[PDB]
Scaffold this active site. Structure first.
Site, PDB file in Angstrom:
ATOM      1  N   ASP A  28       0.761  -0.965   0.160  1.00  0.00           N
ATOM      2  CA  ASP A  28      -0.029  -0.207  -0.310  1.00  0.00           C
ATOM      3  C   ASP A  28       0.845   1.206   0.011  1.00  0.00           C
ATOM      4  OD1 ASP A  28      -1.661   1.944   0.236  1.00  0.00           O
ATOM      5  OD2 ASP A  28      -2.375   1.487   2.517  1.00  0.00           O
TER       6      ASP A  28
ATOM      7  N   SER B 241      -0.445  15.566 -12.000  1.00  0.00           N
ATOM      8  CA  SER B 241      -0.718  15.431 -13.715  1.00  0.00           C
ATOM      9  C   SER B 241      -0.830  16.439 -14.498  1.00  0.00           C
ATOM     10  CB  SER B 241      -1.246  14.334 -13.354  1.00  0.00           C
ATOM     11  OG  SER B 241      -2.482  14.021 -14.983  1.00  0.00           O
TER      12      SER B 241
END
Length: 330
Positions: A35, A199
């Site tokens: 994770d 992004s």
């Protein structure tokens, strides 16, 4: 040193991935959920409340000659999905794919929430976010990656998740045969303890690319792609019959529809998520309503590039002094 381990989806939807991890001496092998969105290595154990264990493999520290109680230490964690676990701590030898850390904090669960009990395939979590998020008190503990770092050939790990198939986590090296083209690296902020990046935009299907900054985290422990409501609406508007259902808890679409791809920007590079990766199947057995793999982040407080996005790429988690993230097509 290096390590290399295969990671395998827990079910036919790729809801999560499990990776075998050796703990203790002699080794006890548990299947853990790696994770990158948390920083605790915790396991079902001989200390876990019996009624909260249902099929998981447990760590028994009393059967390990290298286990030592980390005296006084406790931990307690809550995740974005509302699940939680807590307990005490041992140090022990932990190996992943041939790479061994001695003295790793292994957090033994005394209590776990129902979601964990109900998932028989996941024996615990292995956190790979920054150690500043680790919940052990009074002395915060380091992640497996942080402990391994100085021994690794290169201070990196990579995630190469499969679509409806196994993939690979590598530690200490970049497998240049595992991706196509080049790896594009992008800046990381560690201020929140996550692999947080920005992004450069998105496209829906064959549509024009929209240049826009989207801050989010690279999170192997989240199933879906969670993005701003504007972006998500633009995506689902291209799917006949799609709608946001408050009763179901997100966007659904008729299983007769064709899903467009979704492209996200990494610098000047582009990662294309095929439409099929965005299909999470019937909302309930036999239903014609299918659950979407791109959902709104509104009310999470952060955008999350979860498995839906990451499995479309070869992803480098670069833990050099100035951390960065790399993405390549594959």
């Amino acid at each position: 040193s290096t390590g290399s381990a295969t990671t395998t989806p827990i079910d036919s939807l790729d809801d999560a991935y499990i990776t075998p991890v050796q703990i203790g001496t002699p080794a006890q092998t548990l299947n853990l959920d790696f994770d990158t969105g948390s920083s605790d290595l915790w396991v079902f154990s001989s200390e876990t409340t019996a009624s909260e264990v249902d099929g998981q493999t447990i760590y028994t520290p009393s059967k390990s000659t290298t286990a030592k109680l980390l005296s006084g230490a406790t931990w307690s964690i809550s995740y974005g999905d509302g699940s939680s676990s807590s307990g005490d701590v041992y140090t022990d030898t932990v190996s992943v794919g041939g790479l061994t850390v001695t003295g790793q904090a292994v957090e033994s669960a005394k209590k776990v929430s129902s979601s964990f009990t109900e998932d028989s395939t996941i024996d615990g979590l292995l956190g790979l976010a920054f150690s500043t998020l680790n919940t052990v008190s009074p002395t915060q503990q380091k992640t497996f990656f942080d402990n391994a770092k100085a021994s690794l050939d290169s201070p990196v790990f990579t995630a190469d998740l499969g679509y409806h198939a196994p993939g690979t986590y590598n530690f200490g090296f970049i497998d240049t045969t595992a991706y196509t083209g080049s790896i594009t690296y992008t800046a990381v902020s560690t201020k929140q303890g996550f692999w947080e990046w920005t992004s450069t935009g998105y496209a829906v299907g064959s549509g024009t690319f929209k240049s826009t900054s989207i801050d989010g985290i690279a999170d192997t422990g989240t199933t879906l792609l969670y993005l701003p409501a504007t972006v998500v609406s633009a995506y689902w508007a291209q799917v006949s019959g799609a709608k946001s259902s408050s009763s179901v808890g997100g966007y659904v679409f008729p299983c007769s529809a064709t899903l467009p791809s979704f492209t996200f920007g990494v610098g000047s590079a582009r990662i294309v998520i095929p439409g099929d990766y965005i299909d999470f199947g019937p909302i309930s057995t036999g239903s014609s309503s299918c659950f979407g793999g791109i959902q709104s982040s509104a009310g999470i407080g952060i955008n999350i590039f979860g498995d839906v996005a990451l499995k479309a790429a070869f992803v480098v988690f670069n833990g050099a002094t100035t951390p960065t993230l790399g993405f390549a097509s594959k």
